[PDB]
C-alpha cells in the first residue's frame, strides 16, 4: 500500500480562481497505490458538499463539486487513510467574475511536452485590457515569457521541465479571467516524438491574400513528427471559434481548410501532441476579395 503513488490534481483544488456557480472539478491518479481506498470529501462553509465520483479507467478516478456560496472549502483526499498530495487542499471560492475585459485560448491551456514550450494567446475583447498578470503553479517552477503583438493579442508561452499538471493563471486586473486557472496536462514525450519537425504550408496561412468567404487551405506535413495528435485551432479576433476541416490522408499528412466570415485578422494555432510546430500561430489578414 501506497499512499504516495497517488496524485490529485485539477482546477476543484487550486487555492484560487474557482468561482461560485462553475462546476469545480479535479482528479485522482491511483495507479502504483497498490492495495487501499481512496476516500473524496468536499466541505464547503456550511459544511459537507455532494461530490459527483467517475471511473475515468486506468486507476483515474474524476469529482466534481459545486460551489453556491463564496468562500473557504476544503477537500480531503485519502488513500490507505494517508492525505496524498498536500491534502487537505484548501480553496477559496471567488463571487462571480466581473466584466471580462480579455479572452485566452491555445494549446498550452490543456497540454504540452517536458522540455517545450506550452504556447497560448490572449487578446482584448474591446479597446481596454490594462494590466495581465500571468503565473503557472505546478510540480515545479515553469519560466514564462510574454509578448504583446500589437494587435489587441499577447503571445504567451511557458516551460515546464517535470511532468504532471500546471495550473496556468491569466488575471486581468486582479481577477483570474473567467476559467482562469487553465489545467494543463504536461507528459515527458517518448523519443520518435518530433514536432519541430512538422511543417504547415499554403496559402491559408500567408500575411496576404486570404479572402472572406472562400477556402483558406494549407497542408500540415507530419511524416517525421513520430506519432501524436494534430490539433489545429482557428479563431477571427471577435472570440469566435472558426469551423475548419481537417483531412488525414493517412500517409501522415493533412490537408486542412478554413472558411472564414469576417474580413478581420484570423489566428490559426497548430500542435503536434501537444506542442505548436514551427511558425505556429498564424496571424492571418482577411480581406474582402
Known amino acids: 500500500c501506497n499512499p504516495s503513488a497517488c496524485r490529485a490534481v485539477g482546477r476543484g483544488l487550486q487555492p484560487k480562481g474557482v468561482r461560485v456557480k462553475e462546476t469545480a472539478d479535479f482528479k485522482v491518479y491511483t495507479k502504483g497505490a497498490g492495495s487501499g481506498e481512496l476516500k473524496v470529501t468536499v466541505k464547503g462553509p456550511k459544511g459537507e458538499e455532494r461530490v459527483k465520483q467517475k471511473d475515468l479507467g486506468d486507476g483515474v478516478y474524476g469529482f466534481e463539486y459545486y460551489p453556491m456560496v463564496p468562500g473557504t472549502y476544503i477537500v480531503t483526499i485519502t488513500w490507505g487513510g494517508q492525505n496524498i498530495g498536500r491534502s487537505p487542499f484548501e480553496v477559496k471560492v471567488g463571487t462571480e467574475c466581473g466584466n471580462q475585459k480579455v479572452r485566452a485560448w491555445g494549446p498550452g491551456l490543456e497540454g504540452g511536452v517536458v522540455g517545450k514550450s506550452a504556447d497560448f494567446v490572449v487578446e482584448a475583447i474591446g479597446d481596454d485590457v490594462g494590466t495581465l498578470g500571468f503565473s503557472v503553479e505546478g510540480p515545479s517552477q515553469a519560466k514564462i515569457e510574454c509578448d504583446d503583438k500589437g494587435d489587441g493579442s499577447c503571445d504567451v508561452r511557458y516551460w515546464p521541465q517535470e511532468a504532471g499538471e500546471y495550473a496556468v493563471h491569466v488575471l486581468c486586473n486582479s481577477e483570474d479571467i473567467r476559467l482562469s486557472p487553465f489545467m494543463a496536462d504536461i507528459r515527458d514525450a517518448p523519443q520518435d516524438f518530433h514536432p519541430d519537425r512538422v511543417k504547415a504550408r499554403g496559402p491559408g496561412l500567408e500575411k496576404t491574400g486570404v479572402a472572406v468567404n472562400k477556402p483558406a487551405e494549407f497542408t500540415v506535413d507530419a511524416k517525421h513528427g513520430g506519432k501524436a495528435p494534430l490539433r489545429v ?57
Request: with cysteine.
Open 233 to 289: 485551432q482557428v479563431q477571427d479576433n471577435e472570440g469566435c471559434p472558426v469551423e475548419a476541416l481537417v483531412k488525414d490522408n493517412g500517409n501522415g499528412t493533412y490537408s486542412c481548410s478554413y472558411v472564414p466570415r469576417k474580413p478581420v485578422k484570423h489566428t490559426a494555432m497548430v500542435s503536434w501532441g501537444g506542442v505548436s510546430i514551427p511558425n505556429s500561430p498564424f496571424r492571418v489578414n482577411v480581406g474582402a476579395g
